[PDB]
Symmetry: D2
Subunit: 283 residues, 4 copies
């Protein structure tokens, strides 16, 4: 499986989206799992999930790594509403266009917020819900906010550079020795290729601050079986929000990885894959 060989585009039409181009990477043919990426500069479906797509497809799933609006090879957009909800509308437009009735969701950070809004807005269109450090869930009980990683992500958005990209990647990972020239170069390419995405994200953040993303009050509505994952060492989204979700969602469990940065799906790919596949199969 490669980015090139899985790469697809589809036009969506859904509340506020008109003939809007969505890029995604797709493989496999069984039950659909849509994976949704974080909101850092250069983020995209393949970049965030290339260690997971293979094992999920081997397990029998149809995997769609979606580029959210205003990221990677999806169309540029300036959003005046909180991104979780707008992104969720885009997931529904994608599913409608592809004739997918129900999907399991996997969401990292901004993608976790997307997945939560999707589950809230379209409960008949979701299977299982998998959340990896979901963002926007209001204040932490322990962590000063904005968190260290979020500050760096905004710095990179405003002043993109390879050095600042490196710094950010150093804070994303517990084990900085895992940061290869290849990982850096790939993220830098997504940044260099679509500078407008960076400008638009900052404009959107002024229109709809992070507090507007907080869906905490509605967590009780979620009936999807939910699997919450967190890196113990996540410097981007606070560990105690893993507990907030576990207490507020009806059917949830929480798995926390030791020696693990924000990207549990990448830094602990093997264990992440086995747990999530098991959950999809047996929970």
């Amino acid at each position: 499986l490669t980015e090139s060989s899985t790469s697809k585009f589809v036009k969506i039409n859904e509340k506020g989206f008109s003939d809007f181009n969505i890029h995604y990477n797709e493989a496999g043919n069984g039950e659909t799992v849509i994976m949704l990426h974080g909101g850092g500069p250069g983020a995209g479906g393949w970049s965030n999930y290339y260690r997971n797509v293979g094992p999920f497809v081997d397990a029998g799933y149809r995997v769609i790594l979606k580029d959210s609006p205003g990221f990677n090879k999806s169309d540029a957009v300036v959003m005046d509403e909180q991104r979780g909800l707008v992104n969720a509308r885009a997931v529904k437009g994608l599913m409608d266009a592809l004739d997918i009735d129900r999907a399991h969701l996997v969401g990292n950070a901004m993608g976790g917020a997307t997945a939560l809004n999707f589950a809230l807005e379209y409960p008949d269109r979701i299977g299982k819900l998998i959340l990896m450090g979901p963002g926007g869930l209001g204040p932490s009980m322990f962590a000063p906010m904005p968190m260290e990683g979020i500050k760096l992500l905004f710095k990179l958005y405003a002043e993109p550079s390879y050095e600042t990209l490196k710094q950010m990647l150093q804070v994303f990972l517990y084990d900085q020795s895992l940061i290869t020239e290849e990982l850096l170069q790939g993220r830098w390419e997504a940044i260099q290729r679509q500078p407008e995405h960076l400008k638009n994200f900052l404009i959107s953040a002024q229109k709809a601050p992070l507090s507007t993303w907080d869906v905490t009050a509605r967590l009780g509505e979620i009936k999807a079986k939910t699997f919450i994952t967190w890196g113990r060492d996540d410097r981007f989204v606070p560990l105690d929000h893993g507990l907030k979700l576990l207490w507020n969602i009806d059917d949830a469990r929480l798995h926390v990885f030791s020696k693990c940065g924000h990207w549990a799906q990448w830094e602990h790919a093997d264990e992440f894959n086995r747990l999530v596949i098991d959950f999809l199969r047996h929970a």
Copy 2:
């Protein structure tokens, strides 16, 4: 598999144990997993683990459900040292007598303390370490101590009655509707059959208070891959000790079950079994 058909006895000789009778239930023939029970009145290997033994044996493990000294059908004892360490000596004596060189351990509460002391004292004799609400790890950062469940466990030790047994079982479970006459009767039988165990436990607790059980300071020595499990709704041992372990043990992960009392292995048996088996196979 039944209690009767798996029931075995063996004499142990180890530091402070002389021709000391240990009861255990054993089945299967592959890699050894010794499961270690909690410290409440009536506790024993079969009682705590009868929902787990079958699936672990089906998975290919040799399962030994051990009765710790001063519980169930093991010999009565008054302990002047912290129970985790004394119990761990008993596990080593059992393994020595059965010619078992290395075992994976699963430990609930008092059994979790046992498993931690075993890993500390005999690091060459342990495989993987599985901890389910381990007790004795010092103060909670949030929970007033003694915890509600611990108070009830001491009340039952001092004044055993079927009513107080019922109360305790109600606090052990998140879903009290899961408390059958059969579960009650079985725990009550272990209490009625060996009243001396109750007296001796209380005497032991006066000699060696819970603070003596705290091995927090030595957690950094543990090299066993460790899987920590907790019920979100555990009223016996505090949820934040799951985090204490995750931060202090080198290679650990933490799984917390929603809508789950202290006994995650019983209340969430299916998920518990799948996760722990997966961990033993693949971690």
Copy 3:
């Protein structure tokens, strides 16, 4: 100062209250501080606050220890709405009847919920806000709910007895040696004197469960300078809600007392008095 000599009654008329009798104890003549009691059986203004009224009056405050509707010598009531809000309406009716334009509030548990609803509903009628283990603020991130103390409080409501009263008082206090025959007798008298209050509270709880009391989502509206106090060892309302308030209210501080049960105002009266008086004078 005595209960008898401070005892007053006033009729209130406010949204849903018609010629409704409120009992209170009043002393002093400077700025008004209304203290609001917890929701346990037998609770009342004097009982909860008799260690605080003297020092506050010596400091120059007019102190009103209010009996909330359905407690002590206030009129019986069955409430179909969450008690915080209904109680707050009663505080406003009391202030209106006494020609008090603004008051500082001190609220324990149910009284803390009252004080929060008052601050939200009538922001021009409050000075400073003092909260001592306020109840009803939704789930804890650590504590299984209902908490141990809340279970006991409901047990006493349903089956009042002097023994169960004693048990409850034992769980309220960190230092059980502080429980005198006098304290017990006084609480028991309030229970014996108005059995109907007990029945009505249980009926009200069925109509308006604790989740209906959660005003977390509105905490951002509070502009009152706020002083949050908690007993470290509170078995009735969870310590982490002290942090929830500190993060969600604009101008707040949190003081936690070691070796202190739920009743910080009683168990640590001297320090409580000095801190709260200082806050009222200088914050």
Copy 4:
């Protein structure tokens, strides 16, 4: 009161210190309060405490703002043992040289660690113990370590610059608008004036890593009445260590300030002063 007019030097002789020059600022003549500063580059007694010295002296205390070895105008040193203990030896040498039998201590961060070691090593030489974000107390239950602020403090030590100094000061404060040219210039002067202190601190940190500073296991020995303070928004030392202390020290209380960085004594000087003075007078 000014830095110049309060400035004093004294030679100390104590375990490992021989004719070692200590600088301090002193004023007042009643009970002695020694204030102990943090470990960031440029830190010193006056810099950390100039908003507190006046009010404490007005209150009747003799205030000594001590420069710890290897900071400000105290002698340079390379330490091969954990700094808390070495600093505490220096406090005892200072008290011995000045004929001070007992002192109250106030300690910020590294100074909090100093104060804890002093209380442990010389319990007959301490009055009350005041701790403001004490450092070195082992892992956080929530915060990835090293914390954001600690990373920046090390960066400034290795590559001192006015820009990096500014960055660090921005992370120290909740309200960055409080950072004046005067505060910056004063900290920069302490850095520019003694570059060797910077080199030596980094060498010392290699010899004695932060884990060597953890005295958690001995907290039970402290009999001093203890007042623990924390900024809610402290990005240097984790808020949950405030709870660790409150649970582990016999007679403690915890006060947390909203909208407050690491330096509670500076950012919330007025409230800090009133609380600590009250504690010294009345606790």
